């Protein structure tokens, strides 16, 4: 953007705390504050009410999600493997 060069969102941390700390935190401060798309009603209303808990806007649903996002790579691969074991068990 015109107002900055490479601070992104963590400009609000002034000139303190270092450099790679702010680089390692900007990558997460955008994800946790973005609004995801509720895959239950389709609208753009998914938001973090605290650590690990995601809310929607209209369908009023609440889903336990990651601390900074809504699907950890671990969670999604575990769901896939759960599918692949139910398939094996139930033929």
């Amino acid at each position: 953007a015109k107002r900055t060069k490479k601070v992104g969102i963590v400009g609000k941390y002034g000139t303190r705390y270092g450099a790679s700390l702010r680089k390692m935190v900007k990558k997460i401060e955008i994800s946790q504050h973005a609004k995801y798309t509720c895959s239950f009603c389709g609208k753009t209303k998914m938001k973090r009410r605290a650590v690990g808990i995601w809310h929607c806007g209209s369908c009023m649903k609440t889903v336990a999600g990651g601390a900074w996002t809504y699907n950890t790579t671990s969670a999604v691969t575990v769901k896939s493997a759960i599918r692949r074991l139910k398939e094996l068990k139930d033929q």
């Binding site: 941390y13 705390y17 700390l21 390692m24 935190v25 997460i28 650590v51 690990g52 808990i53 336990a64 999600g65 990651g66 601390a67 900074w68 996002t69 950890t72 671990s74 969670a75 575990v78 769901k79 759960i82």
Partner: peptide
Amino acid sequence: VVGVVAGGGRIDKPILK
């Protein structure tokens, strides 16, 4: 309980202050 614990990925953000 089948599945992983919610609140994952928690320790990846420096408390910073």
